[PDB]
Amino acid sequence: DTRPRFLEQVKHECHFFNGTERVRFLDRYFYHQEEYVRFDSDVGEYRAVTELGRPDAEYWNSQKDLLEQKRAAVDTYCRHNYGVGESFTVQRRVYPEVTVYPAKTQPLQHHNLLVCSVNGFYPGSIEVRWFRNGQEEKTGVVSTGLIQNGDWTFQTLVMLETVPRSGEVYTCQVEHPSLTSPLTVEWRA
Amino acid sequence: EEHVIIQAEFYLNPDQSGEFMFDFDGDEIFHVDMAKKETVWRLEEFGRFASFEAQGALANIAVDKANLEIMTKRSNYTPITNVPPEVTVLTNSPVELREPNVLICFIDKFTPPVVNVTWLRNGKPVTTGVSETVFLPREDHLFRKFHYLPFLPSTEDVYDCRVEHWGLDEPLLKHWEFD
């Protein structure tokens, strides 16, 4: 099917700062990927983003009832919906499960990679650090970065390139809003 | 900002496909099954605490359909440019032999929101236990999507996620196997 496609998108966005103390509402209209017109609560009127949206900006701004609907949205829409969903979104907290296992940078070689696998956590904000015998190791650290699982959980792998020596104790340390103190997992060669 | 809530909608011609969903910080709260006229909560727990009148989504989609016609005309019928997806396959937890796990196929950074996705086990299509999300919005106004396959890890099985999209010359296969 090579027939041309045409896409319309609309995004009604509520941005929250300091709980519901400061709120911004954006009514955004898109053709394909191009935003062409928007209502910004900071302004209180529609503004064309591209030439394509000028007729809409002018038509919609001539409708006082419509504008007042949009101007009240921060309260009747944004603050309202925040209240509705807050207990299971804003307040959602799930600790991570943490596993440490050895790996290889190249298949043939001895173990030269320590993987700290951090799984199933929410929200996304997390700090993972490596320690060798109680001293933080900041060199040779590579990660997958933050991975969304699509099901309201995240994961990340944080790897330390190192050649483990007998006696050494490595520690992966994880800090996260769901935790009240750092979570640590040790690995010994 | 601390949090963002987005009500994201689209309508696509000539497919006549329309979607309506809510996003919280990049995760889906719910979408509306347009055909069933029903609210589908992303986690079942969500629906014990909140409700949504699905009919309102229907009304919005109707406006979007009418709006698309006008805009299409205004643009002198300029069509969308295909943007092919990036595809990644991963497991949701570290893999252990015969310990139940889930394969995730992440389809990202693409438009229009139309894709054919197939899970393959040893080169054969599998559908048992599979699930998927609707099209999820990106801040660059492309889309992303997740497909899932629960599985029992073994040395004997290999997997692929196969993705077809109009921006691709051939289907994209991303492989996964044990160790």
Partner: peptide
């Protein structure tokens, strides 16, 4: 609680 729907504005013509 009930989620509220922001509506989508209808364009001219």
């Amino acid at each position: 609680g009930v989620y509220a729907t922001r509506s989508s504005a209808v364009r001219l013509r």
